[PDB]
């Protein structure tokens, strides 16, 4: 039987990978980091409260100008916020109200969203007509589209619930690159700062590092015990952190190809919806199901602070590109800005 | 106050956007959200044409009441990752064929379509997001089941069934077996209706169940539930 021989070879390869990871690990991040000063207590106050959504807010994204926001809720409305003045720049009515992701273009020209309609809809913000119209609708996913991220005005990577990540060409609307290999539904997505690689967290308790220009998985990261719902690169692009339903955040390194540190507490038992990093990467912000965001010392696994003030589950997180503020969205139809 | 002309005009635009958002929310608050569920293509389509590829939107108005019925068919993924989106629906319309008690699902060996429907109903009814959400269970294809129960007994489906091979007793037994999967009888209600291929009063049953759910909701507001 060739199938049993190939299963034995796959088991041998997995054991070789595990042995190479074990032999390459000598001193953990705790053992080197325990000799530096902690960050103390990180206290943040709600500076703005963005009201106007009427259903559970499922996603958000910050602008690269660190002032403009976009948020998605089950109203069927994509509201673009001026976070400095608490002003609604745009309100985009959606064809499908079951939106679970939204992205904002780095140029600021476009907004994507997607959800249970299996379609990433690109919206042209800066039109000659003065309204926000659909640029195009990207179809081809057979499952719910769980995350989308703009590379530029013409390239976008969309995570989806068909156990498949996909890279699209917005000029043609065609499936440029298909990323396959995940067993469970892919729930999160995060682009590298140079947009050369990206990581995806799925429901197979695994994270995979893909290359955009070759379209095939480089490394696979395991260690979680439940469905990964959040993922985010470290700011230099050489590491990333995940968040799953087992109330643990794990930090993984691309070069070491290992898990470095678990950010978990005994008093936290609920799942993690959103994971975001600060500008320096020293603080890891994670949104949980117990209605608040916990700031973690990303180098020391210490609870640096708690961002409490949401009446329902914190579903989405976002730190501005200048690191000035963190914005938490939640199921109680509110967005809050913190400093 | 300490605002420019463009700042004041942007604030005015934001207030107009807030006004349109409030009107849209008030329009959507009077609509009835229904989640349509069932094990495969069993009776969803006949029910849909009786009132009227990701999620399917079905819009119909009955007695000056607009209904939003969502079909999550062909969403072949983990249900728990998107079933919390329908936490605030008015009721769940669960469609079950009565004639597939002896048919096989053909996806798994020795798998019954009826038992797959029981397992899906057990997962949906006792879900954490549907603790207080009522279920309008529809038992599809009663005439086909009635004419085929003479040829094939129900004991091949339920080994512990010892009643007569009649339509009424076995149909009541199937309804009781589906209602026994509700472990939250103190906080939710299951409405069961038997529907034929061409049955006209299906909408009225949905309207009555939705009206009971709406009465249960209004009473909370009055602080009397």
């Amino acid at each position, epitope marked *: 039987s060739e199938l049993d021989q190939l299963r034995q070879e796959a088991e041998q390869l997995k054991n070789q990978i595990r042995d190479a990871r074990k032999a390459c690990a000598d001193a953990t991040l705790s053992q080197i980091t325990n000799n530096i000063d902690p960050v103390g207590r990180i206290q943040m106050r709600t500076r703005r409260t963005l009201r106007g959504h009427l259903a559970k807010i499922y996603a958000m994204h910050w602008g690269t100008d660190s*002032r*403009l926001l976009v948020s998605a809720s089950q109203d069927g409305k994509l509201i673009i916020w*001026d976070s400095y*003045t608490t*002003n609604k*720049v*745009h309100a985009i009515p959606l064809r499908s109200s079951w939106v679970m992701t939204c992205a904002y273009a780095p140029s*600021g020209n476009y907004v994507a969203c997607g959800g249970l309609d299996n379609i990433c809809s690109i919206y042209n913000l800066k039109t*000659r*007509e*003065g*309204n926000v119209r659909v640029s195009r609708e990207l179809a081809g996913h057979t499952g719910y589209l769980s995350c989308c991220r703009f590379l530029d005005d013409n390239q976008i990577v969309t995570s989806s619930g068909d156990t498949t990540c996909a890279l699209w060409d917005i000029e043609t609307g065609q499936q440029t690159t298909t990323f396959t290999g995940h067993t469970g539904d892919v729930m999160s997505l995060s682009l590298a700062p140079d947009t050369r690689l990206f990581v995806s967290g799925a429901c197979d308790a695994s994270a995979k590092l893909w290359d955009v220009r070759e379209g095939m998985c480089r490394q696979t990261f395991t260690g979680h015990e439940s469905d990964i719902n959040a993922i985010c690169f470290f700011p230099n692009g050489n590491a990333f952190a995940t968040g799953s339903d087992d109330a643990t955040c794990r930090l993984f390194d691309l070069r070491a190809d290992q898990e470095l540190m678990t950010y978990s507490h005994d008093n936290i038992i609920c799942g993690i919806t959103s994971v975001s990093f600060s500008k320096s990467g020293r603080l890891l912000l994670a949104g949980y199901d117990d209605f608040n965001c916990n700031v973690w010392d990303a180098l020391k696994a210490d609870r640096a602070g708690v961002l409490a003030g949401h009446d329902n589950r914190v579903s989405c997180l976002g730190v501005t590109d200048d690191g000035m503020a963190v914005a938490t969205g939640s199921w109680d139809s509110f967005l809050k800005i913190w400093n | 106050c*300490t605002l*420019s*002309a*463009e*700042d*004041k*005009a*942007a604030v*005015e*635009r934001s207030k*107009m956007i807030d006004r349109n958002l409030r009107e849209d929310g008030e329009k959507a608050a009077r609509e009835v959200k229904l989640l349509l569920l069932g094990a495969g293509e069993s009776g969803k389509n006949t029910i849909v044409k009786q009132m009227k590829t990701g999620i399917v939107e079905t819009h119909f108005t009955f007695k000056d009441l607009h209904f939003k019925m969502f079909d999550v068919g062909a969403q072949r993924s983990e249900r728990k990752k998107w079933i919390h989106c329908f936490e605030g629906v008015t009721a769940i319309i669960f469609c079950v064929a009565l004639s597939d008690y002896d048919l096989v699902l053909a996806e798994d060996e020795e798998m019954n379509r009826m038992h797959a429907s029981m397992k899906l109903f057990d997962s949906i009814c006792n879900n954490k997001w549907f603790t207080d959400t009522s279920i309008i269970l529809f038992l599809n294809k009663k005439d086909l089941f009635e004419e085929k129960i003479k040829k094939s007994p129900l004991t091949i489906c339920y080994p512990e069934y010892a009643g007569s091979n009649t339509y009424e007793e076995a149909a009541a037994y199937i309804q009781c077996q589906f209602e026994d999967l509700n472990k939250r009888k103190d906080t939710k209600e299951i409405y069961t209706h038997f529907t034929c291929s061409t049955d006209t009063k299906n909408v009225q049953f949905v309207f009555d169940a939705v009206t009971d759910v709406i009465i249960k909701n209004n009473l909370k507001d009055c602080g009397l539930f």
Partner: single-chain antibody
Amino acid sequence: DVQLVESGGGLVQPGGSRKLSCSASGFAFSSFGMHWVRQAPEKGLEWVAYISSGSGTIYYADTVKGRFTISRDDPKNTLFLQMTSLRSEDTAMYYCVRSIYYYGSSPFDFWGQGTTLTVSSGSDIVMTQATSSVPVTPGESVSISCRSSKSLLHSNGNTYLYWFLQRPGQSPQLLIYRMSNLASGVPDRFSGSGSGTAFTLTISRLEAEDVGVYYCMQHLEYPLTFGAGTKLEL
């Protein structure tokens, strides 16, 4: 395409009443605030009236306030300027101007072709252009300077300075909308700069396509005041 067509102009006896219409097509007329800007035969842009989106805010120039009436009907995309008691100084070519206001918006971006109406026979921000007409060689850089009595820099960091170019026999178009921001469809050879009350507009590699009268307008506070107009010749 975005188009604004004016109508209703003509010869009017003094003290008469005429109504101007501005039919809008090719854009969402309801979401745009709308301005009336007239230009006398002496070649000077003058702001007249403004109506916001939803008709919630209406402003008038001090010379037409209580005597002109601006209104819009969003169902049919028409802007109205009901004028009563017309005197000889109202003889001007009235432009219907399109302007939207949000963060990063470009107001005064589209101007209509204008309708010509003929009448027979203190605290404002003064906008100053030192040069009224200068000759320029094509292919060479030119600078148009503008000054303001009040500082146009606001507390929010925006300097509300607008640059308009009006070619001969054409409606004015927007080039720079907040003292540095290049407009849509205008070449990158137009650049604006300045600080406080001193302003400049640089046109590197000038062509015959740039020949016209250049106006500086402030949008810090109503009424909106234009410059005298710097004309480029040769």
